[PDB]
Amino acid sequence: TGTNPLYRGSMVALSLKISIGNVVKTMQFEPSTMVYDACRMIRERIPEALAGPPNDFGLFLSDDDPKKGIWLEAGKALDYYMLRNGDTMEYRKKQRPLKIRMLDGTVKTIMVDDSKTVTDMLMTICARIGITNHDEYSLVRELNWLDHGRTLREQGVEEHETLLLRRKFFYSDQNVDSRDPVQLNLLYVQARDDILNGSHPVSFDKACEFAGFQCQIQFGPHNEQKHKAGFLDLKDFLPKEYVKQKGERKIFQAHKNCGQMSEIEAKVRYVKLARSLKTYGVSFFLVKEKMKGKNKLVPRLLGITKECVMRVDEKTKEVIQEWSLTNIKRWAASPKSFTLDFGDYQDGYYSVQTTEGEQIAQLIAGYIDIILKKKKSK
């Protein structure tokens, strides 16, 4: 029998495998070591850890489910993370390329910090394109709003996916003028995409008026020789609800009525016509109501704005009822329902079936948060 002179009993240090690319290396850390010091010890001991500046790297605990991989917070200690001897920590690059469709419709590639929530990520994305009201904007997956409070990774967003930048809160609108035609085009593309994808619902007549301006903008003035029956792919000029109607003649009439209107003037009229509609700036959700003495549930539209919540008939789009946001005491969402407590401003709660309760609640809470930030600055 040999006895080991190097034997040291009752040691507490964690022994961890530090992975950096193809390099692995076992290192010893005191369980109470702050994450930021562990990063510093790794930088002083493995040459490959010098591939980039410190703020570009962090410690990452992977998982078979990539969505459950986590980035360690700098101000925590290792023992918080319930690590055991033989565990692996990656010293891993935080930056990753994100394909994002911008507000004009183009797809750019930008670098995002994989450890940031979507909220902090939207700040640096908006900064990159000169947007101050970054609180009005969000990302949709290719409306599937991403969760602002969570990272992309933990929402199952993959790094090959292209995400869409889109305005979510309609709080503040600047005037529309030909002075900045780049800005004018941004206002136009967003107004148009919302009409065409149906998140701004409009009448058949209005939808055809819009298409007329859109024809003027994409083709120039109407030429009866070329812009004849069958020319238009209607799914590119009409919301889906109206494609199976024979609107090509009406679109072409409104196109003719633009005469020699310039591209810029047609964008200004398009934006203004959209802003002039009672439906502008309203986010609509489909809910099912319980009518007094009616076992069946009547589908209804719930409208959210920066000022109010409204009950709206599903077809005509008329307002049956309206409560100001200041009149709402509480709200609650579930996977099957959404509920509004109005305090003394009503007897009973307003409770409705819907799958989008969590999304309704986040829209209402976001408008409130925007309002609270404006008063705090005033």
Swiss-Prot record:
It comes from the Eukaryota. The modification Phosphoserine is found at S377. It is found in: Cell projection, Ruffle membrane; Cytoplasm, Cytoskeleton; Cell surface; Cell junction, Focal adhesion. Residues 252-378 are annotated as: Interaction with LAYN. Residues 96-375 form the FERM domain. Disulfide bonds: none annotated. Consists of an N-terminal FERM domain linked via a short unstructured region to a large flexible C-terminal rod which contains 13 amphipathic helical bundles (R1-R13). The rod begins with a five-helix bundle (R1) followed by three four-helix bundles (R2-R4). These are followed by a series of eight five-helix bundles (R5-R7 and R9-R13) in which the N- and C-termini are positioned at opposite ends of the bundle, creating a linear chain. The four-helix bundle R8 does not disrupt the chain because it is inserted into a loop in the R7 five-helix bundle. High molecular weight cytoskeletal protein concentrated at regions of cell-matrix and cell-cell contacts. Involved in connections of major cytoskeletal structures to the plasma membrane. With KANK1 co-organize the assembly of cortical microtubule stabilizing complexes (CMSCs) positioned to control microtubule-actin crosstalk at focal adhesions (FAs) rims. Part of a complex composed of THSD1, PTK2/FAK1, TLN1 and VCL. Interacts with THSD1; this promotes interaction with PTK2/FAK1 and VCL. Interacts with NRAP and LAYN. Interacts with SYNM. Interacts with ITGB1; the interaction is prevented by competitive binding of ITGB1BP1. Binds with high affinity to VCL and with low affinity to integrins. Interacts with APBB1IP; this inhibits VCL binding. Interacts with PTK2/FAK1. Interacts with PIP5K1C. Interacts with F-actin. Interacts with SVEP1. This is Talin-1. It comes from Mus musculus. The gene is Tln1. The chain holds residues 1 to 406 of 2541 of the full protein.
